[PDB]
């Protein structure tokens, strides 16, 4: 998590950034006439980078507080997991960013940071569900309101990504311009957020599976079979969407990476299918 020296380093960082931004703003103000000119002066390189640093700091702090509100506190296992998983995804997102140049500099970063936060949320959600399953308490039946809390988390993230993808499809449809690269950018956003939605769907069907299991076990084949069936189903949906979207664009790298790891996941799915045949 946060070592003591890291915490004091972060406090120093915050105060340095605040002081720098205040000084830059006051400087660009006192040497200008009207709002337009001080705007054109803030957009200058050094002040631009300083303001972007400020924006990043405030966004990370906002997301930290949003997490503290939503998921309370994280268990150490979750933190180990996320600390381990971050770098590969960060590199992949930077690679998505490097696809478009100065033209799409800022909006891509907007959507990328949004995707990063949503992926972190999805992962901590999956880990919290797995904790709930281990920590099941059979003193009471799994009341409608406990599943209601968990499904409140689920539907929160669900309506978030759904609003995003629907608004992006609407933006694509209304923008039949010569700016085709914007359509491709929006298609990347669709791929990412729809992947997140399919992951949420997978989790939803698995938790309904466990709910019906608890239902029948309290009221009145191996579950492994159905869990792996849903696994194959969702991975197949992933592969289908990835093909149907990235083949039109003919992407040099995202296409190859995605489909290679997808065919490796299909290798795993065939092995699980043989497990099913043994369990048939």
């Amino acid at each position: 998590m946060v070592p003591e020296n890291r915490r004091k380093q972060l406090a120093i960082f915050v105060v340095v950034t605040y002081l720098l931004t205040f000084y830059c703003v006051y400087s660009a103000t006192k040497t200008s006439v009207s709002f337009l000119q001080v705007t054109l002066k803030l957009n200058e390189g050094f002040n631009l980078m300083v303001l972007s640093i400020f924006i990043l700091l405030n966004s990370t702090l906002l997301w930290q507080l949003l997490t503290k509100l939503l998921f309370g506190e994280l268990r150490l296992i979750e933190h180990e997991h996320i600390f381990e998983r971050l770098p590969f995804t960060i590199i992949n997102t930077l690679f998505m960013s490097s696809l478009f140049h100065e033209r799409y500099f800022f909006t891509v970063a907007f959507f990328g940071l949004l995707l990063l936060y949503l992926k972190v949320f999805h992962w901590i959600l999956k880990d919290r569900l797995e904790a709930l399953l281990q920590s099941i308490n059979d003193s009471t039946t799994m009341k409608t309101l406990i599943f209601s809390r968990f499904s409140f988390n689920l539907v929160l993230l669900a309506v978030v990504d759904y609003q995003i993808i629907t608004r992006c499809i609407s933006s694509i449809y209304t923008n039949q311009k010569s700016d085709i690269e914007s359509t491709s950018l929006y298609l990347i956003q669709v791929m990412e957020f729809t992947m997140l939605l399919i992951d949420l769907l997978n989790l939803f069907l698995q938790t309904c599976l466990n709910f019906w299991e608890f239902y029948r076990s309290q009221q009145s084949e191996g579950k492994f079979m159905y869990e792996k069936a849903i696994d194959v189903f969702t991975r197949f949906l992933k592969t289908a969407l990835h093909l149907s979207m990235l083949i039109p664009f003919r992407m040099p790298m995202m296409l190859l990476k995605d489909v290679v790891w997808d065919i490796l996941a299909l290798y795993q799915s065939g092995t699980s299918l043989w497990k099913i045949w043994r369990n048939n």
Partner: protein, 602 residues
């Protein structure tokens, strides 16, 4: 005592112009506000500490002579001293008025220079302003035969300022002045080569940031010439050519010095001619350019006693020979050769060939088409273009005598011979000769770069009335500037601002845009809110960014129009649509708009 006065004054060298003395071997400070008490105390300190005793004696003798006897020639001289701040004496605008009034009382409206100056001082209200007396004085000084007075009256009749609009009177006056100016030139200066007078027609406050902010103003900067510019073997010819150029067409801080250029060119030519064949890759360009410049300097005769026609012809044909291989430029060389063999020698067909080779070049301004049209008029069997078309292209390009010749031609025959176009042509000529009607720009700049600021404001106020837009906006800038943000506004008197507003407004109506925005800001500070939006809209119709954004800001507040947030968002989306770099500010302003709207909570 006046003979002794003149004999003493003979030794002081009235005014030093650093633009000229700096040619043997930066910028200036402008003030922000003004206060008469501080100025008179500065005047007292200057008289108490600086002046030398001989100057004390001289000034006392001048006062005694111009007071005791009606000398009528010490009054004028002392008025000029106190007005143009010459002979190291300081500036007074009230005592110069007193003495010019006494002189005018003496010489019973026979001297028109003093009448012109008095009309200016009565129209600008420096000393209240009264337009009728100034107009009477303008008429009177026009009768006596002054050019600038006729010009200011013609302009005042042409723009509609202070009198109703009228085009025929302006046409008549402009024709009169154009005729006099045409007759003030010789035959050689008109036909062969036009004299080269350094123009100071720039507007001040373009050496600084600019007007209404840098990177924000619409009209492009007008500073045509300021120190043009662009390892041991190569760079030597570059440096030598650029020194030659920067000492041929003098700059603003340092005027021209031609003898140095002549010496340098002849030296480098005599030194480089033996082994030119080794400079193929790039240096032949700059060498032949220097060669052509020196040939032109010989043909005209500047920096020397008299022209050397035959040597110039040999030098130019050698330049053209060297240019044939390595495909160098041929502009100035062909132009000058054509000018020579058409008048100096009597072989015309060669001049025709030269010109026809020179028409499509970049270096010509108007000379080619001018000579072609004149010859076609003299020899109709040449089959060379159309006279009207040639003179038209010439006028369009920017050559001075072609303007007048085209005006005469279009007045001689319909060809859309309305009054507006003809008035515009004649005004363009009268304004653009600039060598007789606007000599005071040099004096103004000189007095301005030696810390005497008020006299520069006076010269620029005098040149404003004639219609020299740049002088208008310059006097305006010296009277009121735009204050930096979160800072107290200037403390100038009311008359200063009410005159700066008129100068800004006339500068705007003349064609400039930024003056509209700045006058709108003057009114906004003056708390009018009524006549501001007028100028703001008048400039917004010409696509000014700050104008539009400020009109939005004006709308969305309670001032003027009442809180119409919709039109505010409309104008902000407009300013975001037209130009790009104002994206962030437009978006942030719409965001403030939304925040105001929601804070709906109440």
């Amino acid at each position: 005592p006046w003979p002794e006065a003149r004999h003493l004054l003979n030794t002081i060298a009235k005014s030093r112009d650093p633009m000229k003395e700096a040619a043997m071997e930066v910028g200036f400070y402008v003030p922000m506000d003004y206060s008469p008490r501080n100025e008179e105390k500065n005047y007292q300190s200057i008289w108490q500490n600086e002046i030398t005793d001989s100057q004390r004696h001289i000034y006392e003798l001048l006062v005694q002579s111009s007071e005791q006897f009606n000398n009528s020639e010490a009054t004028y001289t002392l008025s000029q001293i106190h007005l143009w701040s010459q002979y190291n004496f300081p500036h007074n605008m009230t005592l110069a008025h007193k003495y010019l009034e006494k002189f005018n009382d003496l010489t019973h409206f026979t001297n028109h220079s003093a009448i012109f100056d008095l009309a200016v001082m009565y129209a600008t209200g420096g000393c209240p302003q009264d337009s009728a007396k100034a107009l009477l004085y303008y008429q009177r000084a026009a009768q006596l035969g002054n050019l600038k007075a006729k010009q200011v009256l013609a302009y005042k009749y042409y723009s509609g300022f202070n009198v109703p609009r009228n085009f025929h009177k302006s046409l008549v006056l402009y024709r009169d002045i154009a005729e006099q100016l045409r007759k003030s030139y010789s035959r050689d200066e008109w036909d062969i080569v036009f004299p080269y007078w350094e123009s100071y027609n720039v507007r001040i406050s373009d050496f600084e940031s600019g007007l209404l902010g840098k990177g924000l103003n619409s009209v492009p900067s007008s500073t045509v010439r300021k120190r043009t510019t662009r390892d041991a073997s190569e760079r030597r010819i570059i440096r030598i050519y650029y020194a030659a150029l920067n000492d041929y067409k003098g700059t603003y801080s340092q005027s021209r010095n031609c003898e140095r250029a002549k010496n340098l060119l002849e030296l480098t030519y005599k030194e480089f001619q033996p082994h030119v064949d080794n400079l193929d890759p790039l240096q032949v360009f700059y060498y032949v350019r220097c060669l052509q410049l020196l040939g032109h300097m010989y043909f005209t005769g500047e920096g020397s006693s008299k022209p050397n026609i035959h040597m110039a012809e040999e030098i130019l044909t050698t330049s053209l020979e060297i240019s044939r291989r390595a495909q160098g430029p041929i502009g100035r060389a062909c132009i000058d050769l054509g000018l020579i063999n058409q008048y100096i020698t009597n072989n015309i067909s060669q001049a025709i060939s030269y010109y026809m080779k020179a028409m499509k070049t970049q270096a010509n301004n108007g000379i080619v088409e001018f000579q072609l049209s004149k010859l076609a008029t003299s020899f109709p069997e040449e089959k060379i273009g159309d006279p009207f078309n040639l003179m038209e292209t010439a006028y369009l390009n920017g050559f001075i005598p072609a303007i007048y010749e085209f005006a005469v031609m279009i007045e001689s025959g319909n060809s859309k011979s309305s009054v507006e176009n003809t008035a515009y042509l004649f005004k363009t000529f009268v304004d653009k000769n600039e060598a007789i009607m606007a000599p005071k720009l040099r004096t103004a700049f000189a007095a301005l770069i030696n810390d005497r600021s008020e006299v520069a404001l006076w010269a620029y106020s005098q040149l404003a009335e004639q219609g020299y837009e740049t002088a208008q906006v310059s006097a305006a800038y010296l009277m009121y500037q735009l204050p930096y943000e979160f800072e107290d506004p200037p403390r100038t008197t009311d008359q200063r601002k009410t005159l700066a507003i008129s100068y800004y407004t006339r500068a705007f109506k003349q064609g400039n845009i930024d003056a509209g925005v700045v006058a709108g800001d003057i009114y906004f500070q003056m708390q009018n809110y009524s006549k501001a939006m007028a100028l703001y809209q008048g400039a917004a119709l010409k696509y000014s960014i700050q104008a539009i954004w400020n009109l939005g800001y004006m709308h969305e507040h309670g001032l003027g129009v009442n809180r119409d947030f919709h039109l505010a968002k409309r104008y902000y989306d407009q300013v975001s649509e037209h130009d790009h770099r104002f994206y962030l500010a437009s978006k942030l302003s719409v965001l403030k708009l939304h925040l105001k709207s929601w804070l709906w909570i109440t």
